[PDB]
């Protein structure tokens, strides 16, 4: 039943529609009048459902699509190995990765730019990279520019074989519409190949090249002196006295011995106290269970040999007595419109990024990557920032999917009808509870700053005068403490250190401490958790209330992306799913900037630091447990004592970052007026322009028009968000970078 | 040919290269007069 | 209620009438336009004043014109 | 010695902002070894730092009180002090070119309007007619006070769209 | 219209159907008083807990005690208020006008009985 | 129309389960409104009040808290399946009144019966100004 | 530093100025709206026809005016 | 002439919270008058 279906040429490889921009739509077919056809080329041009109607067509433009951008990935991927190649301090940063700072950037002496070239140490001038891309190459074993040099031409290969696929799987075999709607097949071969095969190929890297490397290197042997990883895969000598049960042959694999496998397999939580990672041993057994699990779930779903499950069927089988018809119509639903799919996809991809950022700030697993604070910092601020976007794309294409793609033929009484059958009740039990929650944290913080204002220190929320102690956290915390002593008993160690235990140190500098939580952890964890409520409850008004309400019967013959419905019934501005998102956008940022910034003052303050004789000294010398509980204090002992790197980085290496920290400024002034405004001032006054032009006869062909209100809003949006999160860059970045 | 010269004829191209001229231009002009503030020869 | 005033411009090409939300609209015999149909609202206590006639009017400046003003419970659009 | 502000030659703290800076990039440039790059660059930076100062100095550059030079503004003034080439030459240049930008793009404007579809035009650019207009607007000025006297640089009133009243 | 098992259940409509709010037949001062009674009893806690001087012995439950019949007494304004707003014009006597007024009287003494009985009850 | 229908309310109503966004309070203390059609088969429709209900073959009979709902349930009826329904509006006392096909021959058409109010017979843009009509209580455009 | 800030301070007055003369002059007509006397001195819009007409007004232009202002001072 | 020592005292209470209520419930009765 599963096979390839394949259409032989179907478009042309010609340039005659790269002549004509508007070219995908009929409604830019017939060419520019206005200046907002400009933006609609720019608006609707991957919007390849609006283009054409026939699943295939969309089908074939999503692949071509994601190849072009792994495409754009590996020759983004690329260009880091060339700068990490030619452009860095690698290999002067192999021999002290404790005195050196990771650099890869080196500008061009122009315009007296060439003092952002800082002394970062090891003989080299440039800019100190916060990626980790160091202790990640570190991590794979790589030692010369040569390896470095070959992995850039490699994703450069891999790069061009990527555009010629989508060139080649668009114009010259493009997939049918049911070779993509084999789901079942989609799903065993990714959980098998794309995912089982790449953990297997990754641990036998890490087994015969990593480890080898990793161990000589926290040997303290030179790196030229480690003998290339070539010598590790053919002569078994090496491998043998570096991991004496390599001297058996693949015996203990087959023979089912592997606990021989022992010494380079191996289980010892925590961190290693050479080089404060996780133990690449671990990593290597972590990847090959990875492999075994994934491989046993590819084979799952059946596609052409009778055995498997089908996913209809599983779907259709589970129907509770509450729920009447139990995801019936899904199946059909995620097999047809791309949008759920996409949905669901930014939905468990954000979600994803969000774990990966807790998961390495809390084990870092790369060598020399919690001594370097500032690394850690940008890459849990990163993929924070990535998930937090990811999941709002979620709810944006979900509300897509429901204007677009949603058929109430086929779906009746499933559990989508259902949800939007009590769509009211989910929407204000979530805004009480959003309320709920914004008195119950930020009236606390309120609390506190007044009764501080008015000397009254035993009448806080603080750890000394009312202790609202996260004693749930801490429960878990130490119940995770002993997880090795009674739950874990193969253990070593516990899994991280932030539940308890002694201080890993690298260099003088702490990689990881116990993180204790006391009233302000609580008061900040609520304090997320509304506002993580509060934009949940945006984006699920925006999703359930996308077709129609008691306010608009008819939303969705509006489409999914319109600006209003006129100052009818008392005014309908900002009605659209999309105008939820485009609120809720604020939301997440304001969301993920308290998390953020309680992130950076809690590993400042509880974590980061110094190891003396004495004890360990923080950064901020533990101000959060006093500090943390109000605003007084997040602006003064937060914002204020810190950001002094920033303002004062003028004269040094880091001046661009507060030269950005100002821009960053400016870019989020010069949003307010997109967001605030309307269009027909702006209109009015190019109309004035307009006159000006028509004067000294330079009026445009084109004519001049003021954005569109959902223009505007996105534009708004778009520079607020890029101001925002450039601040927050530019600050953490100088400040930790300053006195990390 | 006369579809990619049209293709390059599109604003977005000449734009670009417009802005790859003039920065070359301004770039080396800086470079090869160093600090230039005060018009003088 | 809103007030919907319609001019001797109209053309009589029904786009108002279909684009009304709340049936406010209606067309009449005329003499005055090429088509022998005029709009009128002869239910303007039901219009919410979504300007949604003024959107579809394909004549130069506006036909049909909506104005705001005492807003009653239809003219709100509450369900409440 | 005009506006109460002292020679760059003659000043005290222009040479303590030119010994700081030196000082500073000679201690940045003590941390390298003399055959290095980094070291290479950290020279280049002095000797740029240097002849910067040096030809800020022995131009007619004033500075106050802080060693930063200031721009003498009024013509006539800085005609009679040796200043013009401060700000009163560069914006005769800049007149020049941006007069330069403003008839090129009214030439291919009024060009490009005579064609059936003038907006294919203006989004489509044609390259040989912007080279070709790129080229010979070097009497831009002439040009244009041409087309004021003959009249067909301005418009009519009666021709230009005029908002209600 | 969407019924529910939570808002259809036999033991919620008879939890529902006893209580002071929805009761048969009762009279709307005994609503009133039984009201007043409850919410007082409640109310008084939290005035008595952490209040500004919860510290000081003796203090606290006296002045947590008068704060909490200050809040009755604010809400009996607050409803009588509502009262002569809401049935100001024209088949349930409580909510009609002088049968929210008896209602509003009831709650009042209800409040200060109440926080009378939370008063005699903690310092026991 | 020719004869204008009486709403019947002991028509069926479509198959549907419970509703959330249906009738308020409204409902008994002022007007509401309801649409009734004659569907020739069973069919799936969506309800702009929530998610999707079943017509029966026969007189369907529907209920709202809005005109705009009802209006927008015959649109989609009519342009899904060129249904031609009708809704009435019914007060908190029982009067009910015709809305939809005054003439009943949808206000599309002209039928040449109907007279033309809140017209003016002057250009737009040919109204006084507001200094013309002050202290008196006439707008520009109302005269 | 004292010219800089001055001519940024004639910055703000202009555009403030601007904004206030646009609105006032514009206030009872304009290419979008020629009808805008008809509607009064403060109106929301006349809904997303024409493109979009969201701040309109006089009153709007007096509201953004006043932003400008608050910068200024 | 000079008020007494507890006029803070006093004055500020009634400012505060029953001439706000007084006023409120005056308000509140004038919204919602009907004729
Ligand atoms: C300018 C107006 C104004 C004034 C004069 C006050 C005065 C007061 N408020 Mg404040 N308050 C105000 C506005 C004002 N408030 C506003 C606008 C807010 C909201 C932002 C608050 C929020 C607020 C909180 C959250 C709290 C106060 C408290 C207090 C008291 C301070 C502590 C004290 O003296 O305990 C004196 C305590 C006594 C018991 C002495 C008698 C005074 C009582 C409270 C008034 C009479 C009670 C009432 C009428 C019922 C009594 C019936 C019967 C027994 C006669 C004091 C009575 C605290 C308080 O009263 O604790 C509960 C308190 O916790 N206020
Ligand atoms: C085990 C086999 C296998 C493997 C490994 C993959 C791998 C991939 N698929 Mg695919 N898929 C498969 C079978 C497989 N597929 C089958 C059988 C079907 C039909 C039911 C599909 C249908 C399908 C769709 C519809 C889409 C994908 C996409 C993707 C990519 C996901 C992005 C990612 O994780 O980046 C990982 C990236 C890398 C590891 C970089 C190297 C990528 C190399 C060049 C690919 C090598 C694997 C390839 C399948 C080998 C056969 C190709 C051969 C003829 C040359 C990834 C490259 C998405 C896509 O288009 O991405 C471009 C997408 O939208 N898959
Ligand atoms: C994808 C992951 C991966 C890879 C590539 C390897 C590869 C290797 N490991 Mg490793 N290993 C892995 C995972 C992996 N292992 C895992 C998960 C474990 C468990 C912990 C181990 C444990 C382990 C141990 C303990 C040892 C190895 C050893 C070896 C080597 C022996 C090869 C062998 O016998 O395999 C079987 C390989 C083949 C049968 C070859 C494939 C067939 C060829 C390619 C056919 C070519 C035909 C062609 C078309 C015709 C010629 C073409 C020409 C004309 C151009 C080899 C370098 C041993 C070693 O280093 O000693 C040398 C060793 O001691 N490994
Ligand atoms: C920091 C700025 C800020 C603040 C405080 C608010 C506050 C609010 N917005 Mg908003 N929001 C903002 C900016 C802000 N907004 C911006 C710029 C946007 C544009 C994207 C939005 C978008 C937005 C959406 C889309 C939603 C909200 C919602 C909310 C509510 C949050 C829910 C809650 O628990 O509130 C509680 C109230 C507060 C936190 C305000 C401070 C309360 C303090 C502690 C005073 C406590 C009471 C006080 C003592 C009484 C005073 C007495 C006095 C009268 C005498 C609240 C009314 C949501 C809503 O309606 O409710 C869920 C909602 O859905 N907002
Ligand atoms: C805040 C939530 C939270 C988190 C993040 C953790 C995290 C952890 N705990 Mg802890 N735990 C928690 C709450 C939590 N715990 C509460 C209790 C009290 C009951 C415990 C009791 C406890 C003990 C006793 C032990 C741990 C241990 C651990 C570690 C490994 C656990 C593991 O293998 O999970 C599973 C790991 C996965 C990756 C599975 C993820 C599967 C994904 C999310 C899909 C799941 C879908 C699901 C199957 C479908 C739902 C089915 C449902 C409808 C029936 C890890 C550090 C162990 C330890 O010490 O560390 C070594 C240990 O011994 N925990
Ligand atoms: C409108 C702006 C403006 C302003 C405020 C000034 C201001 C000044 N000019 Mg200038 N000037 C200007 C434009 C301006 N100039 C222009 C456009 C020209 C033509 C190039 C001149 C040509 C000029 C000459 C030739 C002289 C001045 C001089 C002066 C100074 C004294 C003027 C006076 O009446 O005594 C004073 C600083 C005189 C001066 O140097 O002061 C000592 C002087 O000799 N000006
Ligand atoms: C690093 C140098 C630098 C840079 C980047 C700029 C950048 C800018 N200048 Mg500035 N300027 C500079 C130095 C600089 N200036 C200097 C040194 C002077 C002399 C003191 C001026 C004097 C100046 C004026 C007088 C004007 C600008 C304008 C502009 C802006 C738009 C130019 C334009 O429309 O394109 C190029 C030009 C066109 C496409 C159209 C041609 C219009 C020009 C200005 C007319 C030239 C001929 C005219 C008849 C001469 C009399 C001018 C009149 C004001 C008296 C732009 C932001 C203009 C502006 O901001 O307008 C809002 C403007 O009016 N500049
Ligand atoms: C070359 C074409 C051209 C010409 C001759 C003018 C001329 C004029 N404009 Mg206009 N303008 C233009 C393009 C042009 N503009 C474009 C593309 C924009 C959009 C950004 C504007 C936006 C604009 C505004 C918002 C305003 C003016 C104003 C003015 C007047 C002041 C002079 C000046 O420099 O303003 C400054 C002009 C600018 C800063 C715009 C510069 C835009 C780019 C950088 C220049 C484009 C050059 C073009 C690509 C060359 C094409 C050559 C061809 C061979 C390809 C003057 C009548 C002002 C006015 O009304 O004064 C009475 C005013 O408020 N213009
Ligand atoms: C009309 C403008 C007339 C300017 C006359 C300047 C005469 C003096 C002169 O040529 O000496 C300087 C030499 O600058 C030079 O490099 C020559 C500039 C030539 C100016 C006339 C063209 C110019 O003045 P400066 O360079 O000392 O002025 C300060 C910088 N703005
Ligand atoms: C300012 C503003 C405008 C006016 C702005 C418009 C029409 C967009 C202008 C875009 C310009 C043309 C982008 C390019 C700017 C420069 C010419 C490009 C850089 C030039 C240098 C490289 C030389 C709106 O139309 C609007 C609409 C809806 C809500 C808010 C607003 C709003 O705030
Ligand atoms: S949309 Fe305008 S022109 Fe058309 S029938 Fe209505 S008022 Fe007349
Ligand atoms: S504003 Fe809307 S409801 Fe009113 S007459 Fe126009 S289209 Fe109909
Ligand atoms: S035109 Fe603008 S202000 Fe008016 S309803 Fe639409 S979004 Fe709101």
Same mark, same amino acid.
Do not use: M
């Given at each position: 039943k599963v096979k390839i279906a394949v259409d032989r *040429?179907?478009?042309?490889? *010609?340039?005659?529609? +790269?002549?004509? =921009?508007?070219?995908?739509?009929r409604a830019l077919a017939k060419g520019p009048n206005t200046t907002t056809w400009i933006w609609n080329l720019h608006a609707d041009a991957h919007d390849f459902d609006n283009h054409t109607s026939d699943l295939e067509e969309i089908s074939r433009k999503v692949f071509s699509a994601h190849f072009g951008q792994l495409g754009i990935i590996l020759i983004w991927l690329s260009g880091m190995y060339f700068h990490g190649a030619r452009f860095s301090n690698y290999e002067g940063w192999l021999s002290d990765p404790t005195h050196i700072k990771p650099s890869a950037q080196v500008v061009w002496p122009?315009?007296?730019?060439?003092?952002?070239?800082?002394?970062?140490?090891?003989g080299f001038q440039g800019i100190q990279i916060t990626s980790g891309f160091f202790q990640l190459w570190r991590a794979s074993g790589i030692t010369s520019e040569l390896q470095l040099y070959s992995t850039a031409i490699g994703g450069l290969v891999l790069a061009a074989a990527c555009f010629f696929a989508g060139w080649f799987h668009y114009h010259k075999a493009a997939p049918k519409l049911e070779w993509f709607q084999n789901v079942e097949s989609m799903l065993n071969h990714h959980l098998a190949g794309l995912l089982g095969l790449g953990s297997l190929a990754w641990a036998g890297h890490q087994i015969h090249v990593s480890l080898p490397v990793n161990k000589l290197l926290d040997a303290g042997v030179d790196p030229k002196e480690i003998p290339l990883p070539h010598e590790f895969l053919l002569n078994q000598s090496i491998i043998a006295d570096l991991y004496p049960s390599f001297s058996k042959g693949l015996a203990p694999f087959f023979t089912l *011995? +592997?606990?021989?496998?022992s010494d380079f397999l191996t289980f010892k939580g925590g961190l290693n106290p050479v080089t404060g990672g996780l133990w690449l041993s671990d990593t290597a057994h972590h990847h090959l269970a990875i492999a075994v699990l994934f491989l046993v779930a590819g084979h799952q779903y059946r596609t052409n040999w009778g055995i498997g499950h089908s996913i209809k069927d599983i779907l259709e089988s589970h129907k509770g007595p509450f729920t009447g018809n139990g995801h019936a119509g899904l199946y059909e639903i995620l097999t047809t419109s791309w949008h759920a799919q996409l949905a669901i996809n930014l939905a468990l991809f954000g979600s994803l990024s969000i774990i990966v950022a807790h998961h390495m700030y809390a084990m870092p697993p790369y060598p020399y990557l919690a001594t370097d604070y500032g690394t850690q910092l940008s890459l849990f601020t990163h993929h924070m920032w990535i998930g937090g976007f990811c999941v709002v794309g979620a709810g944006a294409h979900a509300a897509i999917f429901m204007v677009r793609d949603y058929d109430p033929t086929n779906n009746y009484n499933n559990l989508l009808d259902r949800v939007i059958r009590h769509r009211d009740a989910i929407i204000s039990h979530l805004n009480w509870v959003s309320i709920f929650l914004g008195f119950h944290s930020f009236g606390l913080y309120i609390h506190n700053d007044t009764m501080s204002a008015l000397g009254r220190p035993q009448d806080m929320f603080s750890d000394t005068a009312i202790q609202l102690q996260p004693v749930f956290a801490q429960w878990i915390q130490n119940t995770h403490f002993t997880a090795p002593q009674l739950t874990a008993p193969n253990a070593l160690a516990a899994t991280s250190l932030t539940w308890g235990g002694d201080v890993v140190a690298v260099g003088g500098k702490v990689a990881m401490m116990p993180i204790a939580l006391g009233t302000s952890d609580f008061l900040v964890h609520h304090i997320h958790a509304f506002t993580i409520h509060v934009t949940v409850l945006i984006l699920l008004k925006g999703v359930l209330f996308a077709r129609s309400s008691r306010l608009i019967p008819d939303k969705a013959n509006l489409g999914?992306?319109?600006?209003?419905?006129? =100052?009818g019934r008392g005014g309908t501005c900002q009605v659209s799913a999309w105008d939820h998102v485009f609120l809720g956008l604020f939301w997440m940022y304001n969301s993920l900037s308290i998390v953020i910034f309680h992130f950076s003052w809690k590993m400042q303050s509880d974590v980061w630091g110094t190891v003396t004789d004495s004890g360990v000294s923080h950064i901020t010398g533990g101000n959060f447990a006093q500090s943390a509980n109000t605003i007084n204090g997040w602006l003064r002992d937060f914002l204020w004592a810190q950001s002094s790197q920033v303002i004062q980085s003028y004269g040094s290496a880091l001046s661009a970052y507060g030269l950005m920290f100002l821009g960053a400024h400016f870019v989020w002034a010069f949003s307010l007026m997109f967001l605030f405004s309307g269009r027909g001032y702006w209109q009015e006054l190019i109309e004035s322009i307009v006159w000006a032009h028509n004067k000294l006869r330079v009026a445009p062909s084109i004519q001049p028009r003021a954005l569109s209100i959902t223009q505007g809003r996105a534009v708004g949006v778009a520079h607020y968000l890029l101001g925002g999160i450039a601040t927050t860059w530019s600050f953490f970045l100088a400040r930790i970078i300053a006195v990390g | 040919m006369k579809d990619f010269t049209t293709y390059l004829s599109t604003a977005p191209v000449v734009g670009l290269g417009w802005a790859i001229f003039t920065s070359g231009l301004l770039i080396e002009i800086n470079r090869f007069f160093p600090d230039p503030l005060v018009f003088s020869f | 209620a809103h007030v919907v005033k319609i001019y001797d411009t109209c053309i009589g090409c029904t786009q108002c009438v279909r684009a009304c939300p709340l049936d406010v609209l209606e067309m009449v015999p005329w003499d005055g336009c090429k088509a022998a149909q005029m709009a009128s609202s002869p239910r303007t206590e039901d219009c919410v004043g979504c300007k949604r006639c003024e959107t579809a009017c394909p004549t130069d400046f506006l036909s049909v014109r909506v104005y705001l003003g005492n807003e009653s419970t239809r003219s709100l659009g509450l369900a409440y | 010695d005009v506006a109460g502000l002292t020679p760059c030659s003659e000043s005290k703290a222009y040479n303590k902002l030119e010994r700081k800076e030196l000082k500073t990039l000679e201690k940045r440039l003590k941390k390298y070894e003399p055959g290095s790059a980094p070291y290479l660059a950290l020279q280049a930076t002095k000797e740029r730092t240097q002849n910067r100062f040096k030809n800020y100095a022995k131009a007619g550059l004033l500075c106050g009180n802080d060693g930063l030079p200031h721009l003498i503004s009024d013509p006539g003034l800085a005609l009679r002090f040796n200043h013009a080439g401060e700000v009163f030459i560069p914006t005769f240049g800049f007149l020049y070119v941006a007069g330069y930008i403003g008839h090129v793009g009214r030439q291919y404007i009024i060009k490009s309007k005579e064609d059936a579809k003038p907006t294919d035009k203006e989004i489509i650019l044609d390259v040989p007619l912007a080279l070709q207009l790129a080229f010979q607007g070097w009497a831009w000025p002439l040009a244009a006070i041409q087309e004021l006297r003959n009249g067909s640089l301005l418009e009519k009133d009666e021709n230009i769209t005029v908002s209600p009243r | 219209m969407l019924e529910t098992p939570v808002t259809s259940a036999p033991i919620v409509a008879n939890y529902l159907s006893n209580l002071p709010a929805y009761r048969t037949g009762v009279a709307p001062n005994l609503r009133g008083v039984e009201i007043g009674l409850a919410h007082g009893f409640l109310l008084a806690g939290p005035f008595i807990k952490l209040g500004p001087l919860r510290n000081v012995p003796g203090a606290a439950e006296v002045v947590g005690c008068m704060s909490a019949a200050g809040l009755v007494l604010i809400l009996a304004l607050c409803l009588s208020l509502y009262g002569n707003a809401a049935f100001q014009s024209t088949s349930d006597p409580l909510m009609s006008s002088e049968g929210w007024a008896k209602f509003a009287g009831g709650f009042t003494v209800g409040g200060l009985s109440g926080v009378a009985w939370a008063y005699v009850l903690t310092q026991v | 129309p020719w004869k204008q229908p009486e709403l019947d309310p002991d028509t069926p109503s479509p198959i549907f389960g419970g509703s959330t966004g249906g009738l308020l309070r409204k409902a008994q203390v002022e007007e509401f409104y309801v649409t009734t059609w004659e569907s020739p088969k069973e069919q799936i429709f969506e309800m702009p009040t929530g998610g999707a209900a079943i017509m029966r073959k026969g007189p369907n009979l529907l209920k709202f808290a809005r005109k705009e709902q009802c209006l927008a349930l015959t649109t989609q009826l009519r342009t899904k399946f060129k249904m031609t329904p009708c809704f009435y509006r019914v007060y908190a006392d029982g009067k009910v009144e015709y809305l939809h096909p005054k003439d009943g021959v949808y206000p599309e058409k002209v039928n040449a019966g109907r007279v033309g109010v809140n017209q003016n017979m002057r250009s737009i843009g040919e109204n006084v100004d507001p200094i013309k009509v002050k202290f008196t209580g006439s707008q520009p455009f109302t005269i | 530093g004292d010219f800089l800030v001055h001519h940024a301070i004639a910055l703000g007055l202009h555009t403030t100025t601007l904004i206030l003369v646009k609105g006032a002059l514009d206030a009872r007509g304009s290419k979008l709206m020629p009808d805008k006397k008809d509607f009064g001195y403060s109106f929301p819009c006349d809904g997303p026809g024409r493109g979009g007409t969201c701040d309109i007004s006089a009153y709007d232009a007096f509201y953004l005016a006043v932003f400008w202002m608050l910068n200024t001072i | 002439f000079v008020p007494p020592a507890w006029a803070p005292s006093l004055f500020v209470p009634l400012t505060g919270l029953v001439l706000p209520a007084i006023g409120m419930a005056w308000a509140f009765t004038y919204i919602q008058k009907e004729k």
């Open positions: *040429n179907p478009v042309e490889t *010609n340039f005659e529609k +790269w002549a004509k =921009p508007g070219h995908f739509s122009i315009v007296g730019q060439e003092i952002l070239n800082g002394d970062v140490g090891g *011995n +592997w606990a021989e496998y999914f992306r319109f600006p209003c419905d006129g =100052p | - | - | - | - | - | - | -």
